């Protein structure tokens, strides 16, 4: 949409990747 409402920028995407890691780190330990 707009850049200035998306602020800013790369630590928000990185804090999206850590639950993407997390949804495998949380589901592996259930299987262990």
């Amino acid at each position: 949409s707009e850049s200035v409402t998306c602020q800013s920028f790369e630590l928000t995407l990185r804090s999206c990747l850590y639950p993407h890691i997390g949804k495998q780190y949380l589901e592996c330990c259930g299987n262990l």
């Binding site: 949409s1 409402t5 998306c6 928000t12 995407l13 999206c16």
Partner: peptide
């Protein structure tokens, strides 16, 4: 799921 995590990051960029 390599670019899939980055595709959801770009999808979150358009929804932020």
């Amino acid at each position: 799921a390599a670019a899939a995590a980055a595709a959801a990051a770009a999808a979150a960029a358009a929804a932020a």
